[PDB]
Symmetry: D2
Subunit: 118 residues, 4 copies
């Protein structure tokens, strides 16, 4: 299932818990210095025709050591299987002035698995 | 104060009801009637820069409630811009649960803007 | 309907021609209008849209190199033209910058632009 | 290093020429003959020589003489050279829609192409 410790293709660590009511809660680490709170939602009653499980979550990149004045949201689906994975697309929006709002948002794609790259 | 807590309306008649807590959290509901209401959660920067920049945030809605399930989730990533005409400018990703064969068509992308009045 | 001069919300200027079975050509520049700010674009559109009231799908690219400047990057816009009532072109875009592999995660910006034949 | 034939993992093939002027022109076959479409776009014809990749983008409108999906895809990305050359992209697919359905007009995704079939 979704609950557990996941790693993306860059070594970041996604420690998540999926609650019964549809919640996602946890920590995202890019040690404690580099660790941040997360929260999100997931479809707690997915289709039964082979489709994956829809979900999303948010990290604001502030903690007690640093603040980058930004937030990433990941939107994706869990795909169960021999090598379970969470395939996401993400949007990183930074706090900008109006003048710089056109370049406020980065987009990318993260694949999470249970194994950490070397 | 952060200025985010309250009711927000988008360009299509949707209604976003949120509370911004002291620990950086966003919680609330997103709706159109009970059949159209859904839970949300997210994060925001509680210590934004003081150089005129907006306030980074993000939130997620999974499209299941007690009355229906679209096997889908939307994440909104963006920033709060205070002032007379406060607004929250976002970009969103809607991922549907799909089979892998159909995964290429799993994610819709768009943008929404929210205001305090309709 | 697509052939013409369009402007986005930030005042960029898009001069485009739609050819017989689907080509888009033209140029893209800044509202300042200096030549150092002008770039080539190319793209495609649907030359036989539906007859049910739906818009016309299209897209194009600009690489941000010209004779004066090189940002080592490129934007693509994807959208639809919808006619009558004041023609509009509603788009989403992607800007990719050349990066080392180590920085590829930060290579791409996303946004949206709406163009009208009015400034 | 861009000119030639590129493949994805979905059975798509495209043949492109990277012109000395920055143009990209070619054909995109969505299914390995009634499935071929024109492609055109642009790329950075003087990239850096510091390890960075080469920026590029292209479009395909899904109409040909035999069929028409009333839609178009744009890919934005970069070429990475070397023994193991790649084109790494993000893409957007927009369909023609009525305004009532415009909220659902655009799909987003990513695709990587290689020189090895």
């Amino acid at each position: 299932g979704i609950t557990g410790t996941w790693y993306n293709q860059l070594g970041a660590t996604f420690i998540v818990t999926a609650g019964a009511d549809g919640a996602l809660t946890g920590t995202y680490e890019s040690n404690a210095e580099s660790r941040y709170v997360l929260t999100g939602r997931y479809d707690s009653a997915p289709a039964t025709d082979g489709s994956g499980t829809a979900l999303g979550w948010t990290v604001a990149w502030k903690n007690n050591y640093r603040n980058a004045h930004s937030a990433t949201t990941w939107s994706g689906q869990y795909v169960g299987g021999a090598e379970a994975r969470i395939n996401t697309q993400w949007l990183l929006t930074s706090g900008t002035t109006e003048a710089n709002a056109w370049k406020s948002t980065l987009v990318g794609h993260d694949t999470f698995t249970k194994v950490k790259p070397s």
